[PDB]
Design a protein around this motif. Sequence first.
Motif, PDB file in Angstrom:
ATOM      1  N   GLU A 109      41.521 -44.784  45.908  1.00  0.00           N
ATOM      2  CA  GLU A 109      40.420 -43.835  45.961  1.00  0.00           C
ATOM      3  C   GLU A 109      39.501 -44.051  44.767  1.00  0.00           C
ATOM      4  O   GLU A 109      39.962 -44.330  43.655  1.00  0.00           O
ATOM      5  CB  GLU A 109      40.990 -42.418  45.964  1.00  0.00           C
ATOM      6  N   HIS A 127      34.863 -36.515  40.551  1.00  0.00           N
ATOM      7  CA  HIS A 127      34.315 -36.247  41.873  1.00  0.00           C
ATOM      8  C   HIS A 127      34.746 -37.373  42.802  1.00  0.00           C
ATOM      9  O   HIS A 127      34.416 -38.542  42.570  1.00  0.00           O
ATOM     10  CB  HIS A 127      32.790 -36.152  41.789  1.00  0.00           C
ATOM     11  N   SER A 128      35.514 -37.024  43.832  1.00  0.00           N
ATOM     12  CA  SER A 128      36.029 -38.035  44.745  1.00  0.00           C
ATOM     13  C   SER A 128      34.951 -38.537  45.686  1.00  0.00           C
ATOM     14  O   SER A 128      34.270 -37.748  46.355  1.00  0.00           O
ATOM     15  CB  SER A 128      37.156 -37.434  45.585  1.00  0.00           C
ATOM     16  N   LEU A 129      34.840 -39.858  45.795  1.00  0.00           N
ATOM     17  CA  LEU A 129      33.939 -40.471  46.758  1.00  0.00           C
ATOM     18  C   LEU A 129      34.492 -40.441  48.179  1.00  0.00           C
ATOM     19  O   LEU A 129      33.746 -40.686  49.129  1.00  0.00           O
ATOM     20  CB  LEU A 129      33.607 -41.891  46.327  1.00  0.00           C
ATOM     21  N   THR A 130      35.780 -40.138  48.348  1.00  0.00           N
ATOM     22  CA  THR A 130      36.346 -39.938  49.677  1.00  0.00           C
ATOM     23  C   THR A 130      36.102 -38.523  50.189  1.00  0.00           C
ATOM     24  O   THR A 130      35.534 -38.335  51.272  1.00  0.00           O
ATOM     25  CB  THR A 130      37.844 -40.259  49.672  1.00  0.00           C
ATOM     26  N   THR A 131      36.529 -37.507  49.432  1.00  0.00           N
ATOM     27  CA  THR A 131      36.542 -36.149  49.945  1.00  0.00           C
ATOM     28  C   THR A 131      35.332 -35.331  49.529  1.00  0.00           C
ATOM     29  O   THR A 131      35.102 -34.263  50.102  1.00  0.00           O
ATOM     30  CB  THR A 131      37.776 -35.395  49.439  1.00  0.00           C
ATOM     31  N   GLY A 132      34.593 -35.772  48.514  1.00  0.00           N
ATOM     32  CA  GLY A 132      33.538 -34.973  47.942  1.00  0.00           C
ATOM     33  C   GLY A 132      33.998 -33.843  47.050  1.00  0.00           C
ATOM     34  O   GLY A 132      33.150 -33.113  46.529  1.00  0.00           O
ATOM     35  N   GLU A 133      35.302 -33.681  46.840  1.00  0.00           N
ATOM     36  CA  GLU A 133      35.797 -32.614  45.992  1.00  0.00           C
ATOM     37  C   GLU A 133      35.685 -33.000  44.519  1.00  0.00           C
ATOM     38  O   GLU A 133      35.663 -34.185  44.154  1.00  0.00           O
ATOM     39  CB  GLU A 133      37.259 -32.298  46.316  1.00  0.00           C
ATOM     40  N   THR A 134      35.616 -31.981  43.672  1.00  0.00           N
ATOM     41  CA  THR A 134      35.617 -32.132  42.227  1.00  0.00           C
ATOM     42  C   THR A 134      36.852 -31.440  41.674  1.00  0.00           C
ATOM     43  O   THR A 134      37.207 -30.339  42.106  1.00  0.00           O
ATOM     44  CB  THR A 134      34.350 -31.519  41.627  1.00  0.00           C
ATOM     45  N   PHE A 179      36.217 -42.632  42.244  1.00  0.00           N
ATOM     46  CA  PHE A 179      35.702 -41.420  41.645  1.00  0.00           C
ATOM     47  C   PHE A 179      34.501 -41.696  40.761  1.00  0.00           C
ATOM     48  O   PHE A 179      34.434 -42.726  40.079  1.00  0.00           O
ATOM     49  CB  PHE A 179      36.744 -40.777  40.706  1.00  0.00           C
ATOM     50  N   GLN A 180      33.597 -40.722  40.738  1.00  0.00           N
ATOM     51  CA  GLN A 180      32.578 -40.612  39.702  1.00  0.00           C
ATOM     52  C   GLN A 180      33.053 -39.540  38.731  1.00  0.00           C
ATOM     53  O   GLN A 180      33.347 -38.416  39.152  1.00  0.00           O
ATOM     54  CB  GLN A 180      31.224 -40.236  40.308  1.00  0.00           C
TER      55      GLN A 180
END
Length: 60
Positions: free
Chosen positions: A25, A41-48, A27-28
């Motif tokens: 996975e 911030h996950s580039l898969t789920t959009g969650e932070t 992340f930014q």
Amino acid sequence: GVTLFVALYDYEARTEDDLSFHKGEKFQIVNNTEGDWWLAHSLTTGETGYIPSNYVAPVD
């Protein structure tokens, strides 16, 4: 530019504010000036949420 990070290992969240993620996975990073747990911030789920920084590496 920005530096993204990739998970080296799977991780299961055990608190409200951490993220669960899979190996590979991406992340930014939102904040890493707060200790070894980074707000990401996950580039898969959009969650932070927080991730353990030793579970990721910078993407070349």
